[PDB]
Design a protein around this ligand. Structure first.
Ligand SMILES: C[C@@H](Cc1ccc(O)cc1)NC[C@@H](O)c1cc(O)cc(O)c1
Length: 445
């Protein structure tokens, strides 16, 4: 009870770290700031959207909003010769011919809140530095998954866990006060180092305290605690429009936990075990890539982010309960295959739905998120029981590191590859899911 409560709290408090980029690092509509614009808007009395129409460059042919977002007319707005009705009509017959410069004078963001993007100006040529935030976090996970085993091998368990909790709490708080991007990424990285160590430690403790007659149940509980964490994060992000306030409020939960007081070659030597390991690695990679992929996509494209994220998080609960039934009554291999086929098909269909059908797109997104949630429940158990107890620890640690490599790769896909073609990420997610579906059928039941 008491211990189950602090471990579930630690799980719920992990979820804001993993997915916080969706709310701490949203990108609003933006355009080059300039002198004289506000003064001409006062003199003529422009309304906001009207001011945007007269001032900001046009979106251009069938797309190319980049030239509105990252460029401006090289025009002297201070000139009283400009017309109140339309200043650009005083200068060129076609608005395309005017000289375009970059946003050297800074940017204007349409939001009452703030995000790391809006604070550090992670837009245009800098825009990759946003995804680098999630890259640094997943690199933290990757290094920590190696370092924690050596630390726990050479330092006492209870002290190890208390240390990693303290480090996570303090680095999380300090990130809220970080004065520049590089310092922020160093706190992010350090938190990435300790976050997954804390999570897996709590999971180990809770699955040790509860016997196998209830272990599976308590594990699914622990997971639903992560879902509750996503819901709490959604409420906090709704109530707290500023990222710095959100980053404090996210970190203080951890202070309650404080206030409370072999042969790696073995995975590959045998060709059967080698093939099985490669499959399990692929499934882990694909599910991690799909889960972070869809969460980041949603955060990057959804128009009603708080509601879409709430619905999608709530949908994880039915998926967990369905898994809890299915593992016992039906099996694992065909369930995890159909759940990956369902996620892949959902990603495929999301390519063809016109974005105005948001009421349908959210349903397809929910079906996909349920599918991958079931897959994530199934894969943990299959990855565990397919390895003998002697090998289990090494195999889980290694395969769950491919999760983190996928988490390092995914941000560049979702935030950079999408710029080539908006559908492309969903094409990749479709291919990855459908292949993980097919490959799943090769595992023994
Ligand atoms: C990296 C991973 C750690 C991990 C390790 C071993 C394991 O069996 C399951 C998970 N946590 C984040 C994410 O992948 C995730 C999200 C979620 O909503 C539920 C999850 O279970 C996992």
């Amino acid at each position: 009870k008491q211990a189950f409560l602090i471990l579930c709290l630690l799980s719920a408090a992990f979820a804001p770290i993993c997915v916080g980029i969706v709310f701490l690092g949203f990108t609003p509509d933006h355009h080059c700031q300039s002198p004289g614009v506000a003064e001409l808007s006062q003199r003529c009395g422009w309304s906001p959207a009207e001011e945007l129409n007269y001032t900001v460059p046009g979106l251009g042919p069938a797309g190319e909003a980049f030239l509105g977002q990252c460029r401006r007319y090289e025009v002297d707005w201070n000139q009283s010769a400009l017309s109140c009705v339309d200043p650009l009509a005083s200068l060129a017959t076609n608005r395309s011919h005017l000289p375009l410069g970059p946003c050297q004078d800074g940017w204007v963001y349409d939001t009452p809140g703030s995000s790391i993007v809006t604070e550090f100006n992670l837009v245009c040529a800098d825009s990759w530095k946003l995804d680098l935030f999630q890259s640094c976090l997943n690199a933290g996970f990757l290094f920590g998954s190696l370092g924690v085993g050596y630390f726990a091998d050479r330092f006492g368990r209870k002290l190890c866990l208390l240390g990693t909790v303290l480090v996570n709490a303090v680095s999380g708080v300090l990130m809220a006060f970080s004065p520049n991007y590089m310092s922020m990424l160093l706190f992010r990285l350090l938190q990435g180092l300790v976050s997954k160590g804390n999570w897996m430690a709590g999971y180990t403790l809770i699955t040790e305290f509860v016997g196998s007659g209830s272990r599976r149940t308590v594990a699914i509980m622990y997971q639903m605690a992560f879902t509750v964490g996503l819901v709490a994060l959604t409420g906090l992000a709704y109530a707290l429009p500023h990222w710095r306030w959100l980053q404090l409020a996210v970190s203080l939960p951890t202070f309650l936990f404080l206030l409370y007081y072999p042969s790696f070659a073995d995975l590959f030597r045998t060709p059967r075990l080698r093939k099985r390991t490669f499959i399990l690695m692929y499934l882990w990679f694909t599910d991690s890539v799909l889960y972070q992929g869809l969460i980041l996509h949603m955060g990057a494209t959804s128009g009603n982010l708080y509601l879409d994220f709430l619905y999608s998080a709530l949908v994880e609960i039915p998926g967990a309960f369905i898994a809890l039934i299915t593992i016992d009554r039906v099996g694992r291999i065909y369930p995890m295959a159909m759940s990956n086929l369902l996620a892949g098909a959902a990603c495929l269909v999301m390519i063809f739905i016109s974005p105005d059908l948001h009421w349908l797109n959210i349903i397809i997104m929910c079906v996909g998120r349920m599918g991958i949630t079931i897959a994530i429940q199934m894969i943990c158990l299959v990855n565990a029981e397919l390895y003998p107890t002697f090998v289990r620890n090494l195999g889980v640690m290694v395969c769950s590191s491919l999760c983190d490599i996928g988490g390092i790769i995914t941000p560049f896909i979702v935030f950079r590859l999408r710029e080539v073609w908006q559908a492309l990420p969903l094409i990749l997610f479709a291919v990855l899911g459908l292949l993980a579906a097919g490959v799943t059928l090769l595992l023994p039941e």
